[PDB]
Design an enzyme around this catalytic site. Structure first.
Site, PDB file in Angstrom:
ATOM      1  N   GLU A   1       3.094 -14.642  -3.353  1.00  0.00           N
ATOM      2  CA  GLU A   1       4.267 -13.944  -2.851  1.00  0.00           C
ATOM      3  C   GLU A   1       5.451 -14.864  -2.525  1.00  0.00           C
ATOM      4  OE1 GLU A   1       2.107 -11.639   0.188  1.00  0.00           O
ATOM      5  OE2 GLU A   1       1.444 -10.400  -1.476  1.00  0.00           O
TER       6      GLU A   1
ATOM      7  N   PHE B   1      -3.151 -15.159  -0.441  1.00  0.00           N
ATOM      8  CA  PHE B   1      -2.347 -14.403  -1.443  1.00  0.00           C
ATOM      9  C   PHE B   1      -0.782 -14.517  -1.239  1.00  0.00           C
ATOM     10  CE2 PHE B   1      -6.295 -11.264  -2.289  1.00  0.00           C
ATOM     11  CZ  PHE B   1      -6.988 -12.392  -2.956  1.00  0.00           C
TER      12      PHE B   1
ATOM     13  N   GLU C   1       0.772  -1.268   0.000  1.00  0.00           N
ATOM     14  CA  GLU C   1       0.000   0.000   0.000  1.00  0.00           C
ATOM     15  C   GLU C   1       0.784   1.287   0.000  1.00  0.00           C
ATOM     16  OE1 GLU C   1      -0.806  -2.727   1.877  1.00  0.00           O
ATOM     17  OE2 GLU C   1      -2.267  -3.324   0.436  1.00  0.00           O
TER      18      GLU C   1
HETATM   19  C1  LIG Z   1       0.440  -9.380  -0.856  1.00  0.00           C
HETATM   20  O1  LIG Z   1      -0.624 -10.175  -0.454  1.00  0.00           O
HETATM   21  C2  LIG Z   1      -0.632 -10.394   0.969  1.00  0.00           C
HETATM   22  C3  LIG Z   1      -2.053 -10.075   1.485  1.00  0.00           C
HETATM   23  O2  LIG Z   1      -3.164 -10.979   1.295  1.00  0.00           O
HETATM   24  P1  LIG Z   1      -3.292 -12.470   2.023  1.00  0.00           P
HETATM   25  O3  LIG Z   1      -4.371 -13.327   1.355  1.00  0.00           O
HETATM   26  O4  LIG Z   1      -1.894 -13.087   2.318  1.00  0.00           O
HETATM   27  O5  LIG Z   1      -3.818 -12.021   3.466  1.00  0.00           O
HETATM   28  P2  LIG Z   1      -5.318 -11.937   3.906  1.00  0.00           P
HETATM   29  O6  LIG Z   1      -5.262 -11.008   5.070  1.00  0.00           O
HETATM   30  O7  LIG Z   1      -5.604 -13.428   4.076  1.00  0.00           O
HETATM   31  O8  LIG Z   1      -6.123 -11.274   2.684  1.00  0.00           O
HETATM   32  C4  LIG Z   1      -6.126  -9.848   2.493  1.00  0.00           C
HETATM   33  C5  LIG Z   1      -7.303  -9.335   3.349  1.00  0.00           C
HETATM   34  O9  LIG Z   1      -7.118  -7.980   3.810  1.00  0.00           O
HETATM   35  C6  LIG Z   1      -8.277  -7.189   3.451  1.00  0.00           C
HETATM   36  N1  LIG Z   1      -7.877  -5.894   2.832  1.00  0.00           N
HETATM   37  C7  LIG Z   1      -7.407  -5.754   1.570  1.00  0.00           C
HETATM   38  N2  LIG Z   1      -7.159  -4.455   1.310  1.00  0.00           N
HETATM   39  C8  LIG Z   1      -7.488  -3.774   2.435  1.00  0.00           C
HETATM   40  C9  LIG Z   1      -7.443  -2.422   2.754  1.00  0.00           C
HETATM   41  N3  LIG Z   1      -6.986  -1.573   1.812  1.00  0.00           N
HETATM   42  N4  LIG Z   1      -7.845  -2.013   3.996  1.00  0.00           N
HETATM   43  C10 LIG Z   1      -8.286  -2.903   4.920  1.00  0.00           C
HETATM   44  N5  LIG Z   1      -8.336  -4.220   4.630  1.00  0.00           N
HETATM   45  C11 LIG Z   1      -7.945  -4.679   3.399  1.00  0.00           C
HETATM   46  C12 LIG Z   1      -9.091  -7.994   2.410  1.00  0.00           C
HETATM   47  O10 LIG Z   1     -10.519  -7.769   2.432  1.00  0.00           O
HETATM   48  C13 LIG Z   1      -8.661  -9.450   2.612  1.00  0.00           C
HETATM   49  O11 LIG Z   1      -9.636 -10.257   3.335  1.00  0.00           O
HETATM   50  C14 LIG Z   1       0.364  -9.341   1.516  1.00  0.00           C
HETATM   51  O12 LIG Z   1       1.464 -10.026   2.080  1.00  0.00           O
HETATM   52  C15 LIG Z   1       0.833  -8.521   0.311  1.00  0.00           C
HETATM   53  F1  LIG Z   1      -0.002  -7.450   0.090  1.00  0.00           F
END
Ligand SMILES: *[C@H]1O[C@H](COP(=O)(O)OP(=O)(O)OC[C@H]2O[C@@H](n3cnc4c(N)ncnc43)[C@H](O)[C@@H]2O)[C@@H](O)[C@@H]1F
Ligand SMILES: *[C@H]1O[C@H](COP(=O)(O)OP(=O)(O)OC[C@H]2O[C@@H](n3cnc4c(N)ncnc43)[C@H](O)[C@@H]2O)[C@@H](O)[C@@H]1F
Lengths: 253, 252
Positions: free
Chosen positions: A181, A176, A100
């Site tokens: 990653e 993800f 982000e």
């Molecule tokens: C690249 O990817 C991972 C992040 O995703 P993962 O699937 O590993 O983690 P998870 O928490 O299981 O999924 C992401 C969740 O976070 C919420 N989310 C996304 N974007 C936001 C924002 N902008 N604000 C608040 N919450 C957010 C989603 O709704 C998902 O449920 C990282 O290591 C790197 F980014």
């Protein structure tokens, strides 16, 4: 309920791009060569003038080649299940970088958009629920954002996980991080440092060296990366305690 | 000092981003569009010597830009920018100036009027340690007054209690000059948070020195007053960046 696309998508995108370009992260991340117009064109062509589910993991490739910044060695952070805690601790780029803080994560963060066939080539009224689209369309943008971000990480990387979720292992091949990653970390990575979050006043579910954390340790070992793991390190515990100072884990003596 | 490049593009970009996506559940949207706000802001200093400004130059900008502020949530600070912002936590615990539309659009920017075309200098600015006081404090003074005037209910004020050279509260700070006297009767209480930086000697204390000065000023203004030194939530936040500091010790 219907999913609502972001309004004035192009204005919002070009405003945040311009803001970031000139003012944000200047001493922390480098500028990309493409201007904001050229970035918009590569982003827009990924999805426009197509049905909203007609995307795949290649669609944003040009956009990410344009938008991907080189990332600071040892500073890249990854997270699963602990968005707020990981970002609070990364501290807006001051201690670690998250997706982000990079140009594309910053421009698209929280936005909602989708293509349509009819002019003007994207849907200003509604977007379908991601679950109705094939996984490669549903994951086309943030899956490519995640692979491209992970592919640029050098030196030590840090991974914050949820160790108090009785239904969601702390590490999962299906998150993800596990899809996009970990398997795209290059040989420029030397170490994975895991921070296990034990949420205050909750049951401890996962611990360093056991369960999914142990599966993660062995995966990392095999990529020839070093590995370490810590549970609620003090610097993190203090943040948690600032928001819940009566919690037992925050007691003084 | 070097002005911000593409001042208008930056201003209009942050304006648009703010309008559509920022603080949507915390702060209201202003009536004017981004192009009207830019006109107001620009005319405030355009085609004038970079140092011919007063507390009234940006009056109409601030008037178009002003939002009503959530009751009990406004935060003020002197000398502890970072701690105050980290504690407020981007609108999740408190609001600062930088979360409002005008503070957000102009935070960290640098801009200069000039007499000759195009009304503003894109290459150099007056090190404003050069200017008359009223032209120097002209933007953020009006910002501070307009912000403080929008405050309702309880307000919070974070100060440095560990500076041997600068009092916790000073009548010549922006807080002293522009915020405290602009608090209307919709404000009911001033809650002070004294910061005692980790590893440093304690200089200022509640109920003494410049803080007693302040308490009598607040009580005379017909507001309630309270004051606390390193309350736990603030302490723990300071501990996160320096966890080995003696003050940060926890149970064995
Ligand atoms: C690249 O990817 C991972 C992040 O995703 P993962 O699937 O590993 O983690 P998870 O928490 O299981 O999924 C992401 C969740 O976070 C919420 N989310 C996304 N974007 C936001 C924002 N902008 N604000 C608040 N919450 C957010 C989603 O709704 C998902 O449920 C990282 O290591 C790197 F980014
Ligand atoms: C309104 O005023 C205070 C902060 O200003 P004070 O003078 O009380 O505090 P001090 O820390 O002693 O001075 C810092 C100075 O920086 C300038 N300033 C105010 N706001 C900004 C922003 N957003 N960016 C850059 N500089 C700024 C002022 O000259 C301050 O005096 C808070 O309660 C409110 F912000």
């Amino acid at each position: 309920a219907a999913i609502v696309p972001t309004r004035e998508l192009e204005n919002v995108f070009l405003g945040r791009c311009k803001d970031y370009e000139i003012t944000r992260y200047l001493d922390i991340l480098p500028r990309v060569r493409s201007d904001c117009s050229a970035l918009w064109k590569d982003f827009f062509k990924a999805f426009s003038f197509k049905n909203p589910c007609d995307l795949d993991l290649g669609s944003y490739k040009d956009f990410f080649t344009s938008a991907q910044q080189q990332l600071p060695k040892n500073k890249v952070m990854f997270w699963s299940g602990v968005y707020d805690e990981a970002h609070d601790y990364a501290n807006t780029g001051r201690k670690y970088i998250t997706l982000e803080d990079t140009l594309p994560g910053y421009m698209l963060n929280s936005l909602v958009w989708c293509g349509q066939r009819a002019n003007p080539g994207f849907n200003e009224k509604v977007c379908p629920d991601f679950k109705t689209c094939p996984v490669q369309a549903r994951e086309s943008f943030w899956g490519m954002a995640s692979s491209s971000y992970a592919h640029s990480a050098e030196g030590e990387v840090t991974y914050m996980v949820d160790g108090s979720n009785p239904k969601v292992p702390a590490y999962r091949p299906d998150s993800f991080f596990g899809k996009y990653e970990l398997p795209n970390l290059t040989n420029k990575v030397t170490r994975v440092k895991v921070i296990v979050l034990h949420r205050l006043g909750e049951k401890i579910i996962e611990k360093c060296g056991a369960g999914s954390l142990l599966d993660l340790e062995k995966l990392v070992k095999a990529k020839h990366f070093a590995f370490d793991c810590v549970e609620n390190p003090r610097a993190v515990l203090f943040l948690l305690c600032s928001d819940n100072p009566n919690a037992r884990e925050c007691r003084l003596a």
